[PDB]
Amino acid sequence: MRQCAIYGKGGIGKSTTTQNLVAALAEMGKKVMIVGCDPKADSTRLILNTIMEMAAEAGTVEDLELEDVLKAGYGGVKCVESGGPEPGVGCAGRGVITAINFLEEEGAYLDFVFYDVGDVVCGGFAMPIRENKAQEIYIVCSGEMMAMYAANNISKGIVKYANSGSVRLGGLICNSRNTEDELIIALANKLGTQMIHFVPRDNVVQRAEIRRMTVIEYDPKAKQADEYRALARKVVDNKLLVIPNPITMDELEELLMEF
Amino acid sequence: MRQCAIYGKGGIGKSTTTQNLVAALAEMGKKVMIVGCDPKADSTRLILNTIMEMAAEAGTVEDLELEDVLKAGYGGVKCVESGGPEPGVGCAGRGVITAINFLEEEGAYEDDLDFVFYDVGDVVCGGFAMPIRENKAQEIYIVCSGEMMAMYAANNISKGIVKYANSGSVRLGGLICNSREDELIIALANKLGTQMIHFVPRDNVVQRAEIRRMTVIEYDPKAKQADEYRALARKVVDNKLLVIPNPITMDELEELLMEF
Amino acid sequence: SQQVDKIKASYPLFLDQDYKDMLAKKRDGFEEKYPQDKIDEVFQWTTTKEYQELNFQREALTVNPAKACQPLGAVLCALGFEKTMPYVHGSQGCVAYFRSYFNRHFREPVSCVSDSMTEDAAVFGGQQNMKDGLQNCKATYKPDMIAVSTTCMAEVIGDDLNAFINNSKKEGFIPDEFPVPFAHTPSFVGSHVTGWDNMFEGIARYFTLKSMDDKVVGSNKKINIVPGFETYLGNFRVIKRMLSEMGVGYSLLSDPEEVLDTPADGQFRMYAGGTTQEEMKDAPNALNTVLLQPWHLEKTKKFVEGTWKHEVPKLNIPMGLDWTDEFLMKVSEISGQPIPASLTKERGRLVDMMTDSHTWLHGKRFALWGDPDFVMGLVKFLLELGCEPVHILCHNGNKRWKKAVDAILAASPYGKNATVYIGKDLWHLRSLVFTDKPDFMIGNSYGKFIQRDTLHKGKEFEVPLIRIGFPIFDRHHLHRSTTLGYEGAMQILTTLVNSILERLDEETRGMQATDYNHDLVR
Amino acid sequence: SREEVESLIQEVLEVYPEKARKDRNKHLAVNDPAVTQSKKCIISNKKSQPGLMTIRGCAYAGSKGVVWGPIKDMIHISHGPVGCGQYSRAGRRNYYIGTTGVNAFVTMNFTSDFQEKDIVFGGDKKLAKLIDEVETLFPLNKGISVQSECPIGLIGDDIESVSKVKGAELSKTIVPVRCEGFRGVSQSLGHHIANDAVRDWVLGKRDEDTTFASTPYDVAIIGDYNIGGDAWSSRILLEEMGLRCVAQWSGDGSISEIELTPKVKLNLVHCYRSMNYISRHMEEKYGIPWMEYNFFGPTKTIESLRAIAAKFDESIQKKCEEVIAKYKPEWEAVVAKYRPRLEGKRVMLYIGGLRPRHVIGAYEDLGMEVVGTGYEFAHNDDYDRTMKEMGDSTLLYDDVTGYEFEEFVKRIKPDLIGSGIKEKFIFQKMGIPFREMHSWDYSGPYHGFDGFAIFARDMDMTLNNPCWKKLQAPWE
Numbered sequence A: 001m002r003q004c005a006i007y008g009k010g011g012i013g014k015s016t017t018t019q020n021l022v023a024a025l026a027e028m029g030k031k032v033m034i035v036g037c038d039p040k041a042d043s044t045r046l047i048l049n050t051i052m053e054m055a056a057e058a059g060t061v062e063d064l065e066l067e068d069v070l071k072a073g074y075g076g077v078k079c080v081e082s083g084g085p086e087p088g089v090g091c092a093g094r095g096v097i098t099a100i101n102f103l104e105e106e107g108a109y110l111d112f113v114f115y116d117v118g119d120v121v122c123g124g125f126a127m128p129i130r131e132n133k134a135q136e137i138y139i140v141c142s143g144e145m146m147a148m149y150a151a152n153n154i155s156k157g158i159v160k161y162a163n164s165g166s167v168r169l170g171g172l173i174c175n176s177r178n179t180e181d182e183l184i185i186a187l188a189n190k191l192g193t194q195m196i197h198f199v200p201r202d203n204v205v206q207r208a209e210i211r212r213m214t215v216i217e218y219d220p221k222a223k224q225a226d227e228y229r230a231l232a233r234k235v236v237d238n239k240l241l242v243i244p245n246p247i248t249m250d251e252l253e254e255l256l257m258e259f
Numbered sequence B: 001m002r003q004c005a006i007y008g009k010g011g012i013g014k015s016t017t018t019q020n021l022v023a024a025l026a027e028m029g030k031k032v033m034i035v036g037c038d039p040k041a042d043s044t045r046l047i048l049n050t051i052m053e054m055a056a057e058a059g060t061v062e063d064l065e066l067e068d069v070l071k072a073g074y075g076g077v078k079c080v081e082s083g084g085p086e087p088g089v090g091c092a093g094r095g096v097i098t099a100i101n102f103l104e105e106e107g108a109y110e111d112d113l114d115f116v117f118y119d120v121g122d123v124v125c126g127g128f129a130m131p132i133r134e135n136k137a138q139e140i141y142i143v144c145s146g147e148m149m150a151m152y153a154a155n156n157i158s159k160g161i162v163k164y165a166n167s168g169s170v171r172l173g174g175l176i177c178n179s180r181e182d183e184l185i186i187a188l189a190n191k192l193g194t195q196m197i198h199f200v201p202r203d204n205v206v207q208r209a210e211i212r213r214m215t216v217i218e219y220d221p222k223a224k225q226a227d228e229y230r231a232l233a234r235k236v237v238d239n240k241l242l243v244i245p246n247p248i249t250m251d252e253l254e255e256l257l258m259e260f
Numbered sequence C: 001s002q003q004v005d006k007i008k009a010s011y012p013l014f015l016d017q018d019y020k021d022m023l024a025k026k027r028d029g030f031e032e033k034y035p036q037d038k039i040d041e042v043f044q045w046t047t048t049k050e051y052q053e054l055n056f057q058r059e060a061l062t063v064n065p066a067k068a069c070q071p072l073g074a075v076l077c078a079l080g081f082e083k084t085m086p087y088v089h090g091s092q093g094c095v096a097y098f099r100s101y102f103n104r105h106f107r108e109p110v111s112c113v114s115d116s117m118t119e120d121a122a123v124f125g126g127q128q129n130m131k132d133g134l135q136n137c138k139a140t141y142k143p144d145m146i147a148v149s150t151t152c153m154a155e156v157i158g159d160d161l162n163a164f165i166n167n168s169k170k171e172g173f174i175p176d177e178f179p180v181p182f183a184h185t186p187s188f189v190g191s192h193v194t195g196w197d198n199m200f201e202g203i204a205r206y207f208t209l210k211s212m213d214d215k216v217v218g219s220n221k222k223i224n225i226v227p228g229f230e231t232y233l234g235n236f237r238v239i240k241r242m243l244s245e246m247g248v249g250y251s252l253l254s255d256p257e258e259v260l261d262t263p264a265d266g267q268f269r270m271y272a273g274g275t276t277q278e279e280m281k282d283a284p285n286a287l288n289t290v291l292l293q294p295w296h297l298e299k300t301k302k303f304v305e306g307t308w309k310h311e312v313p314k315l316n317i318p319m320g321l322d323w324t325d326e327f328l329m330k331v332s333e334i335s336g337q338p339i340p341a342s343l344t345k346e347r348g349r350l351v352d353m354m355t356d357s358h359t360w361l362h363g364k365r366f367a368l369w370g371d372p373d374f375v376m377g378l379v380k381f382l383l384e385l386g387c388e389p390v391h392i393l394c395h396n397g398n399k400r401w402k403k404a405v406d407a408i409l410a411a412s413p414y415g416k417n418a419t420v421y422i423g424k425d426l427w428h429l430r431s432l433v434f435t436d437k438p439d440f441m442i443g444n445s446y447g448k449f450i451q452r453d454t455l456h457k458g459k460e461f462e463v464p465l466i467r468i469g470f471p472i473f474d475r476h477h478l479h480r481s482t483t484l485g486y487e488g489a490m491q492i493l494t495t496l497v498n499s500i501l502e503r504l505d506e507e508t509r510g511m512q513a514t515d516y517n518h519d520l521v522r
Numbered sequence D: 001s002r003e004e005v006e007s008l009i010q011e012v013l014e015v016y017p018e019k020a021r022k023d024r025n026k027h028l029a030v031n032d033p034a035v036t037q038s039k040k041c042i043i044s045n046k047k048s049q050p051g052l053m054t055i056r057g058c059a060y061a062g063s064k065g066v067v068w069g070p071i072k073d074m075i076h077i078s079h080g081p082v083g084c085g086q087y088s089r090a091g092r093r094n095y096y097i098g099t100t101g102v103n104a105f106v107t108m109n110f111t112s113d114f115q116e117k118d119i120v121f122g123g124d125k126k127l128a129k130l131i132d133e134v135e136t137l138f139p140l141n142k143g144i145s146v147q148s149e150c151p152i153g154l155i156g157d158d159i160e161s162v163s164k165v166k167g168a169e170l171s172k173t174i175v176p177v178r179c180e181g182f183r184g185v186s187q188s189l190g191h192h193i194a195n196d197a198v199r200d201w202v203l204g205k206r207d208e209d210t211t212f213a214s215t216p217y218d219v220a221i222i223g224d225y226n227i228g229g230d231a232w233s234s235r236i237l238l239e240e241m242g243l244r245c246v247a248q249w250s251g252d253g254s255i256s257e258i259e260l261t262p263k264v265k266l267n268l269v270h271c272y273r274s275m276n277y278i279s280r281h282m283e284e285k286y287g288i289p290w291m292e293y294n295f296f297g298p299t300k301t302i303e304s305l306r307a308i309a310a311k312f313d314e315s316i317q318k319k320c321e322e323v324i325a326k327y328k329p330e331w332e333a334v335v336a337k338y339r340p341r342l343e344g345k346r347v348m349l350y351i352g353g354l355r356p357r358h359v360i361g362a363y364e365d366l367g368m369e370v371v372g373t374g375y376e377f378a379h380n381d382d383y384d385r386t387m388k389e390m391g392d393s394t395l396l397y398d399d400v401t402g403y404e405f406e407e408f409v410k411r412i413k414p415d416l417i418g419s420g421i422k423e424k425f426i427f428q429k430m431g432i433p434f435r436e437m438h439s440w441d442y443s444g445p446y447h448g449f450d451g452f453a454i455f456a457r458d459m460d461m462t463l464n465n466p467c468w469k470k471l472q473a474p475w476e
């Protein structure tokens, strides 16, 4: 079994590509589970009861039943959402921390486990990459100034936990804006990793999104659907796992100046 | 003395627009102060030692002088960065609480400013809502796009406004769209009961300036995009529409999107 | 075994042979205890100057602290108001501990509630807890006011107390006009004293901020007195006594003297006395405001000078002769009331006591600790007595405080072998009394362990504890003493000479050995 | 008294708002000793209603305060701000023999005393540094525990990684306990987290190890915290019975004793609530059976000794009768002296998760009846065990509020109350004799035969004390 964590700026369509990537994974005959740990998005709406809300209805997390929080969707992909507060209050980090612990202790773990994580603004959002958790991290980005800045920052987090334990960067996933392709390959090389795959911007993705489906479910025979299949196969066979080497702001600006 | 908070999805150009806006504002002769409260971005790099780092160095916040943290930049804009932990550790939320508190206690807001701009990160907790508590920001502007996850973020923020609005004096001043997307965001505002204060067009000059650590106003005052930010600035300075937003459903959202 | 008419409790029960033998079998057989010679070697080393350099080089570890967290001071401040329930927003563990801690010191009941924030409230925010909690507390315990403070957990997650309380009123959980002052009191900032300052200022704000337009300074002709974190009941009493003796109209803001000392007459009174709501509302109309413990009433001072427009006097804590004289003359100046014959005579009686006892007090060396104001007034007094306050420790003190106390030490020949330590704890001080041995320590109950350690090194190296400060858990009714004024100075002086004489009588009680100096008259 | 306690319950509850009213209703009951299942009578271990002055502590109090704290040769670190550590510093009388600051560290308070910057930047680097400091300053420690306070749990401080790297490096056993105060609903979950931390980081250290010389009579006292010397006063009997007591869990416990516990033949569990978890674990992994015992008062001590000795051979059973006979003259003397002074007196109790049912027999050996009893944090299995030990129409209360307890006492009017420090001065004010049944009011032991002597002495000195006759003024 392989546990993987997906990070990256959200305003790109990070959760959408995470679910499309798993969809194709399921289509290949792989048993996968998605653990949503992102407060800014819904990591399971396309494949298909959060841990926190159900924990509250049962009294405490100790009364929680893994069955009230699990649920399968397309291709049998298992889905759980950690839960978190309503905007402007509470602590979403602790919600991820609590969610993940419950899953460990309730032995919720199957070929791949995929954590769709939110911005590493604190300790709780790094829980997915601690000892004995996700081993491979994929960062989805694009050729946008701050999208790249986000990946580089995430990389700094990967470094802290990689030096401490066993978790590595598997590569960059480029969500195309149609502007780029080469730029991300350059960043990855700077980072010492790889651009695992370039995801073209096909409008079908959005058509599927509105219908609450991945591309592989909405229209398999579609062109974009094969892209996700090639992304899946590359991740299935990826062997390149490294400790990134984040760059300086000066280095990022300089890179963008060449395009 | 108007305090404003700027929220929105970062993958857009939230920090860049905030700074281009404040630059246009300072260009009109307005005295502005920018307070960086976003761990996922650099809020003052275009206008120019954080409060948290400076504090640790000196021992504690109580040992901090305002002059050590406040630094004047383009147009005389005063800049302060809250600071926070490195990625994957610490608690950036509390860092924001501490910084704002320090600014309150150290009399930074009582110097005779025209505007204060908080560039806030995603409201994943109470700390990142520090800017919209009482005696803080009264006007909220959200930067958005025609993207889905970008409009959904605009709504989540509105729900957060609603919550602190029923409790005090804080309103939604409107939507700012970073480039029929023009129409989409207008409807999103009508649904929210607010407005799209301005549609910032897409223009490579913004990136040109940004990568060179400048706002368009400073990088090229004669640029057409420069006049776009001057147009936004004037609409903000004269804005009178402050409202409590009426958030929509993800269903109602998928309806709006599907209609375009 | 136990003989029914001479029953033994733990001491000396376990000193009996069968227990002593059993304990030895437990040790040799299953404890894998380090040999006594090694235990003895390490102890002696923890006594040396070498160990002390290492100890003082600590930057991450804190051992045996001489301070507590903000909310504790907040609860005490709130108890000083009429029929108010101290309410701490956050997790309940804190409250059980706050109550226990004060119970053990005052030997009285201490009322305080929490809104029991659990793991899901940590993730969702404590808004619901605040709604129901305020409603339940008001309905069950019926206070006239609820004073809200916070625990660290609620501070980390940024629960907006102001919004949460306003939404509570808006949704009908508590009346819109029901007084609910609040103060964010983070555990990880300052100490218990900072909690008092934040809470007092929070209440002052609540009752006066909006109403400032109809206030005229000096119109009610009283002087406000803000006490600060005070755990000696006699200190509330002596200040109220001296002002009434002078005919000075005053208002004491935060007075827990009655709740913390109700009578055992057959009924339990949850609330007793306290500063009324009207005394706080009418507070800006006072002639001026005197802060008794200025070094931890800084936020309060800023609100009083800033909002109330009062010219707070630069006055130190009224401990010892000079500072009590300064306090009375300032109070005399402000109120227009002259210092009466009764106080004048009381002053001469303290000076009398000083001239009678100076022989035994001269050159006596002391290690001491406590909160910044208390420890500063104590240094000053000791200095007026001809004593040397060799080690001065204030864990929760800051840099400006250390400067002020160094200035006081500079002004007298008795403060020349003295050093002030801020941010240092009782394990740091344990070393100090080992390497630079003083005659006595003046501190709280935690110093009984330092005395135990010094005695293990030997009788000659033993440094006795004189229990003055907070908390005192191992003696009874000391919380009734006075530390403030001439009255407090006389109490402090008697305790010091008699501790000196007690110790001398002990060292001279040896028959034919040291008893040649076991004098009847001393 | 049969329906007078039900109308009392309803009358007391009338003061709460509706939500709190319906929740507290199911937490209060009247006993029926025929109810093997307590869930149709009382529910427990649910969260406390906000603002009602609960008596409960937190998970940290359960972990650091009661389970790990007593272990004498380890250094337990209260990780977070200065508070928790200070309030819990030497508040519980978990006795030990050792040279403090050198090889024992129970009464001391080691903290990371978090400041704002440790909250904002994180404190893992500070923790690592602290561990190096306890090593140069307390070289004779035999292990370190890291006890989480609330902030550590929110901030996501990866303390197990710190424990792993520092432990391997220094060749020290460093145990990380995620016992942050907001977890659970009381001290109870803190017991559980602590038991798990013991098995995951300490218990299996001597697993492949066969150096220890075993005996068929090896036992372990599990769940006796040695309050006032309670455990020593219990093992004197066990060892006079021919048994070898290899371990004492936490009370005067050492780390080596814990490591040596899987080597025994039987786990004797006193405190069922706090350590049934580790006992159950020792049964499935090492095959060691466990049984519950009660050393409060003669009737229970005698019963316990007999049951414990019946698990072994005829020589231990013979020595069991030897010990019962040895102490028979002594405890009969105590009964002869104090029982006539105490007969027919009524007691209401409200303690933690074991004493409210455990001290009943001892009170009844002095002729006293317990008319009310309750727990702060017990689960239904403790209440199941409580039904047999209590009288019929008696009051049962789980997580009693300050209001409820005061009013129940006003109706019932007990001659003596047994609870903690937070309610002690409330009832003395009210003229009702009070004994602390947590700290034994700085007396103890109360366990075993010698402890019974002290228990009786104490109930008598307080109940028949001359001060209680003087609460009211002769002029009114």
Ligand code: CFM
Residues within 6 Å of the ligand: D062, D066, D092, D187, D225, D227, D271, D272, D273, D274, D351, D352, D353, D354, D355, D356, D437, D438, D439
């Ligand atoms: S309140 Fe025991 S389950 Fe626990 S500290 Fe006291 S009735 Fe505890 S017997 Fe024990 S030594 Fe105790 S007295 Fe179980 S250890 S959480 Mo407060």
Ligand code: CLF
Residues within 6 Å of the ligand: C069, C070, C071, C091, C092, C093, C094, C095, C097, C150, C151, C152, C153, C187, C188, D058, D059, D060, D061, D080, D081, D082, D083, D084, D085, D148, D149, D150, D179, D180, D181, D182
């Ligand atoms: S439940 Fe933070 S410092 Fe320690 S007392 Fe608190 S305010 Fe003060 Fe339990 S883990 Fe501790 S006692 Fe969490 S915080 Fe209370």
Ligand code: SF4
Residues within 6 Å of the ligand: A090, A091, A092, A093, A094, A121, A122, A123, A124, B090, B091, B092, B093, B094, B124, B125, B126, B127, C156, C157, C158, D154, D155, D156
């Ligand atoms: S920054 Fe993280 S740990 Fe801190 S309050 Fe916010 S979500 Fe919680």
Ligand SMILES: [Ca+2]
Residues within 6 Å of the ligand: C106, C107, C108, D425
């Ligand atoms: Ca008393």
